[PDB]
Scaffold this active site. Structure first.
Site, PDB file in Angstrom:
ATOM      1  N   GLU A  28      60.007   7.342 -51.961  1.00 49.79           N
ATOM      2  CA  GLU A  28      58.839   8.166 -51.648  1.00 49.79           C
ATOM      3  C   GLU A  28      57.934   8.491 -52.836  1.00 49.79           C
ATOM      4  OE1 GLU A  28      62.040  10.343 -50.100  1.00 49.79           O
ATOM      5  OE2 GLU A  28      60.878  11.109 -48.402  1.00 49.79           O
ATOM      6  N   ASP A  44      64.398   9.759 -48.655  1.00 46.98           N
ATOM      7  CA  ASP A  44      65.323  10.885 -48.576  1.00 46.98           C
ATOM      8  C   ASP A  44      66.182  10.816 -47.321  1.00 46.98           C
ATOM      9  OD1 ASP A  44      64.365  11.839 -50.956  1.00 46.98           O
ATOM     10  OD2 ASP A  44      63.079  13.365 -50.163  1.00 46.98           O
ATOM     11  N   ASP A 104      67.081  13.298 -45.368  1.00 43.19           N
ATOM     12  CA  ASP A 104      66.689  14.242 -44.318  1.00 43.19           C
ATOM     13  C   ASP A 104      65.895  13.519 -43.226  1.00 43.19           C
ATOM     14  OD1 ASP A 104      63.787  14.234 -45.128  1.00 43.19           O
ATOM     15  OD2 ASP A 104      64.598  15.225 -46.910  1.00 43.19           O
ATOM     16  N   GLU A 123      62.702  13.833 -42.306  1.00 39.76           N
ATOM     17  CA  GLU A 123      61.355  13.416 -42.685  1.00 39.76           C
ATOM     18  C   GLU A 123      61.454  12.081 -43.430  1.00 39.76           C
ATOM     19  OE1 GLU A 123      58.011  14.674 -42.285  1.00 39.76           O
ATOM     20  OE2 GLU A 123      59.083  15.658 -40.646  1.00 39.76           O
ATOM     21  N   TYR A 183      62.100  16.776 -59.591  1.00 42.01           N
ATOM     22  CA  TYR A 183      61.230  16.982 -58.384  1.00 42.01           C
ATOM     23  C   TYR A 183      60.703  18.427 -58.211  1.00 42.01           C
ATOM     24  CZ  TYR A 183      59.757  13.697 -54.723  1.00 42.01           C
ATOM     25  OH  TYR A 183      59.059  12.803 -53.963  1.00 42.01           O
ATOM     26  N   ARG A 212      59.550  19.800 -55.813  1.00 40.20           N
ATOM     27  CA  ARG A 212      59.751  20.208 -54.428  1.00 40.20           C
ATOM     28  C   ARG A 212      61.218  20.140 -54.073  1.00 40.20           C
ATOM     29  NH1 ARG A 212      54.432  17.214 -51.670  1.00 40.20           N
ATOM     30  NH2 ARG A 212      52.936  18.400 -52.937  1.00 40.20           N
ATOM     31  N   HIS A 239      67.357  17.321 -52.961  1.00 34.08           N
ATOM     32  CA  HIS A 239      67.201  17.288 -54.412  1.00 34.08           C
ATOM     33  C   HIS A 239      68.001  18.401 -55.095  1.00 34.08           C
ATOM     34  CE1 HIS A 239      63.509  15.553 -52.632  1.00 34.08           C
ATOM     35  NE2 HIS A 239      63.475  14.755 -53.684  1.00 34.08           N
TER      36      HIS A 239
END
Ligand SMILES: [Zn+2]
Ligand SMILES: [Zn+2]
Ligand SMILES: [Zn+2]
Lengths: 49, 827
Positions: B8, B87, B89, B91, B295, B297, B333
């Site tokens: 990503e 990732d 998850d 999303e 990261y 985020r 993360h």
DNA sequence: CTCTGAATCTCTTCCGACGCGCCGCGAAAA
RNA sequence: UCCGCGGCGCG
DNA sequence: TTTCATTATCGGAAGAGATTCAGAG
């Protein structure tokens, strides 16, 4: 360094001195050849050359 | 062949390609790359999903990822097996799903890998025990995405009809506003409780000073409410004999905090550096891209073992044993921290000063959280005086522990039980229970995450949307609810209670997990949801008497309309809160379109008043005659000022006051008039939204457009009938502005069709061109290859140039104007 | 004038003794 | 430690 | 005309194929 060393060690223009007699050393140092890279080969050498 | 890996974040890719070198080709999607753009076809076309046709959807590449997606398609042939490494998850899982459907190919050509860390001990195991994409996880994310879509595209329109155009509603958006609205009402309706405190200065038997606070009288908490009572007490304390009752010495501890997760970083940067959420993330972004931190985020405060050994290694060499705990500090993360503990903030000379400050904040939090705590010796003195009880508390630092790396920025005299104390003086102090503090950007984010409302990558975005939409405003770095926010919040709570409940998201997450765990089917879950939602929507569509959403409600007031003198009423639009004349509701014959802007009086909280600052703000407000609710204040003339009740329009109290006032006349966006340099301001009327300049000598007006702040200038427009439009029946007109010189269609708000002119076109209509523009018609019409040439604005150099395109790509040829001549060459 | 068959050219393929002393070289992987 | 190559000389 | 949330910016000789020229219909 590697290229220089291999050239001075393995090239057909880097002959092994015989040094049997002083005249041998002289005649080997003054030798002139048409062989080696950029030169001829024993088989391809025509009678004219 | 070569393996293609996709992640990503670009920064993360560059890093992976390294710990993997050649033979592989790492790249990044840089986000999502694809997303969305009884029953109604137009509504379904707009939403991109059909709730009435088993949720069929219409995804489409983002208008800014064309290049990104295109490069993957050509690169895909070279790669043998494609490795989707987004990732884990839902999303990330969905981004992988979209990549696989945009790149095409066969399932077997795709693989799913998850990277633990950057360490080779991770990037290796990545391809060791991999797998494929999970459908349940993917469908769970599709369910969330679709539910958010339906709400926004189906509720907002209802608002446009019942309340005003430009309005919006959303699962996250609307509860954020509700939070601000509730705090606003909380503040307005509160009432400070005056209370007094009494302190006494005394001398020990030795001669040392000892400050005391009065805590009890006759065994009841001492808390006088007025000066009279405070005096009655001081009179007694002045004559009393003071003696020590107890001295309780006790060891107490304190502790460093957790490393900053996106939310906590924002809060810490806000409290210690005055940084706003958006700024903090900008600096953090720089630091990450330069490899200094991980990261920006994240919602996890976890630390890898390596990270933990690295910091303990550092603490051990720089502070000693007393600072290093026997074993790693545990807590409930990865977390945001320096990528290398050995790198100090002062050595980042390639970063802005603020980025160095943020780095230092992140660094210290990371080392302290691993450092030892601050041991103190706390002392508590109990004193008796007649029927009163007094107290004194002290503390002496014995060991800094973690505060060594994270500094923050008390000595009670020796006295034993039974000792007498000599009274020196008594100091009474008046105080006022203060109202709840107003929200800040980081502070609201904190509340959202606490209730699991938003996401790390969306918090900042949320804070901005609610402002741009006009629901709340920020002043002195604090939130204030706007009238419109209250209006929408009340309507939404009335017709969509479920959606407006704070736990709606939590409840949704449970259902989404069930879909992810084969304990429910996604379409069935959406069907249930949609059934409930449509039941509410249909009911809201009805007339107020049938339970239908209440449409706006003009509340009049004693003010003279400058056009017709009539009484004037108080109104809310997506633009804000404004003063209107009832003739707006009368047919054309008797219609009045005069409107007045309502400048609010901004609360200026005094930082030096501390906790008092909010309480005094509440004290400052007038109180409504008809009810206890506070009142909020607005300026109508430099001579006149207007008070409005907090429960407006449910409460109809209004007050009007005389005086000398610095009325600004407007509230909203700022724009600078190209024709006179004055301020320019945003205004609404029969054609929606236009933009108009405050200088009464100048009527220069610009206009709003679909996807930009404001149009370029309305200057020197020249029409052409001989150029037809192609998507519409219109004809094309030629226009100048900071953007450049451009062709635009005579019904502009409706046609909205624009294209750059060709040089040959200009040459065809050269007689029409104003005297300056003529030079562009002189420009070389065709390139050396005989391609055809278009007129472009070089924003970096603020000049027109001419350029040629083939297959719609630039040929790489350009000609510019330099001293009366046109000069041409490869770009 | 147009096609088919044989000649001519162009390209490809082979092969250029046999013994025997010397000399000094060959390779690295993570 | 068994092999190949390059040069030199003898017939 | 238009609203939501999320993610992250040698030479010589022989043989085979291809090309061209001459003879026939
Ligand atoms: Zn009027
Ligand atoms: Zn009231
Ligand atoms: Zn102006």
């Amino acid at each position: 360094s590697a290229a220089v060393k291999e050239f001075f060690g393995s090239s057909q223009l880097s002959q092994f001195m015989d040094q049997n007699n002083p005249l041998s050393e002289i005649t080997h140092k003054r030798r002139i050849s048409a062989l080696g890279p950029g030169g001829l080969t024993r088989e391809r050498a025509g009678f004219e050359v | 062949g070569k393996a293609l890996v996709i992640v990503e974040s670009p920064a993360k890719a560059k890093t992976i390609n390294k710990y993997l070198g050649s033979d592989y080709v790492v790249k990044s999607s840089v986000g999502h790359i694809r997303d969305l753009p009884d029953e109604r076809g137009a509504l379904v076309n707009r939403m991109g999903v059909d709730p009435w046709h088993n949720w069929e959807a219409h995804y489409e590449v983002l208008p800014g990822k064309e290049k990104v997606v295109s490069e993957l398609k050509q690169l895909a042939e070279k790669a043998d097996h494609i490795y989707l490494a987004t990732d884990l998850d839902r999303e990330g899982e969905a981004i992988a799903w979209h990549l696989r459907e945009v790149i095409g190919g066969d399932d077997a050509r795709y693989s799913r890998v998850v990277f633990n860390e950057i360490t080779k001990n991770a990037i290796r195991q990545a391809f060791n025990k991999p797998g494929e994409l999970n459908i349940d996880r993917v469908n769970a994310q599709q369910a969330r995405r679709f539910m958010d879509r339906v709400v926004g595209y189906m509720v907002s329109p209802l608002l446009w009809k019942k309340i005003a155009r430009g309005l919006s509603a959303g699962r996250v958006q609307s509860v954020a506003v509700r939070l601000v609205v509730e705090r606003e009402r909380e503040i307005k309706a509160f009432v400070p409780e005056e209370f007094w405190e009494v302190d006494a200065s005394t001398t020990t038997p030795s001669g040392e000073a000892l400050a005391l606070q009065v805590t009890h009288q006759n065994d009841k908490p001492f808390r006088p409410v007025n000066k009279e009572q405070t005096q009655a007490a001081v009179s007694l304390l002045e004559k009393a004999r003071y003696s020590v009752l107890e001295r309780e010495d006790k060891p107490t501890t304190s502790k460093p905090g957790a490393p900053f997760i996106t939310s906590t970083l924002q809060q810490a940067a806000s409290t210690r550096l005055g940084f706003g959420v958006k700024k903090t993330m900008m600096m953090a972004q720089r630091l990450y891209e330069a490899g200094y931190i991980t990261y920006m985020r994240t919602d996890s405060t976890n630390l890898s073992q390596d990270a933990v050994n690295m910091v303990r290694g550092y603490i051990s060499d720089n502070f000693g044993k007393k600072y290093l705990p026997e074993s790693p500090n545990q807590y409930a993360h990865e977390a945001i921290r320096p990528s290398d503990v050995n790198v100090m903030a002062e050595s980042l000379k390639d970063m802005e000063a603020d980025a160095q400050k943020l780095y230092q904040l992140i660094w210290r939090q990371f080392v302290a959280c691993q450092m030892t705590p601050a041991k103190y010796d706390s002392t508590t003195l109990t004193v008796g005086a007649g029927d009163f009880r007094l107290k004194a508390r002290g503390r002496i630092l014995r060991f800094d522990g973690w505060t060594k790396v994270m500094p923050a920025l008390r000595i009670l005299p020796a006295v034993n039980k039974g000792d007498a104390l000599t009274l020196v003086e008594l100091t009474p102090a008046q105080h006022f229970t203060k109202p709840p503090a107003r929200f800040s950007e980081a502070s609201l984010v904190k509340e959202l995450e606490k209730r699991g409302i938003g996401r790390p990558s969306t918090y900042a975005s949320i804070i901005s949307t609610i402002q741009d939409r006009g629901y709340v405003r920020v002043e002195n770095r604090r939130f204030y609810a706007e009238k419109m926010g209250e209006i929408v919040t009340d309507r939404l709570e009335e017709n969509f209670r479920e959606l407006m409940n704070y736990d709606f998201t939590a409840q949704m997450e449970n259902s989404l997990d069930q879909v992810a765990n084969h304990e429910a089917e996604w379409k069935a879950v959406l069907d249930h949801f949609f059934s409930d939602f449509t039941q509410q929507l249909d009911k809201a569509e009805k007339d107020p008497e049938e339970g239908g959403m209440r449409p706006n409600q003009m509340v009049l007031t004693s003010i003279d309309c400058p056009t017709c003198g009539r009484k004037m009423g108080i109104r809310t639009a997506s633009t804000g809160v404004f003063l209107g004349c009832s003739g707006y509701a009368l047919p054309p014959k008797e219609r009045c379109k005069t409107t007045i802007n309502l400048v609010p009086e901004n609360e200026v909280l005094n930082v030096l008043e501390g906790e008092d600052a909010e309480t005094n703000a509440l004290r400052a407000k007038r109180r409504c005659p008809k009810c206890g609710t506070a009142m909020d204040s607005y300026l109508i003339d430099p001579k006149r000022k207007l008070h409005v009740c907090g429960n407006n329009p449910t409460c109809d109290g209004y007050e009007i006051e005389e005086g000398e006032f610095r009325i600004k006349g407007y509230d909203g966006p700022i724009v600078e008039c190209e024709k006179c340099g004055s301020e320019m301001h945003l205004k609404m009327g029969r054609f929606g939204k236009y933009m108009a300049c405050t200088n009464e000598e100048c009527k220069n007006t610009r206009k709003i457009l679909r996807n930009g702040e404001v149009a370029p200038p309305k200057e020197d427009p020249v029409p052409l009938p001989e150029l037809p439009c192609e998507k519409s029946d219109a004809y094309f007109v030629l226009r100048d502005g900071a953007a450049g010189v451009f062709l635009a269609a005579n019904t502009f708000p409706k046609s909205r069709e624009t294209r750059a002119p060709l040089v040959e076109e200009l040459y065809r209509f050269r007689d029409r061109l104003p005297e300056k523009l003529r030079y562009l018609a002189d420009a070389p019409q065709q390139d050396p290859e005989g391609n055809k040439t278009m007129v472009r604005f070089s924003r970096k150099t603020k000049q027109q140039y001419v350029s040629s395109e083939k297959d719609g790509k630039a040929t790489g040829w350009s000609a510019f104007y330099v001293d009366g001549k046109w000069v041409e060459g490869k770009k």
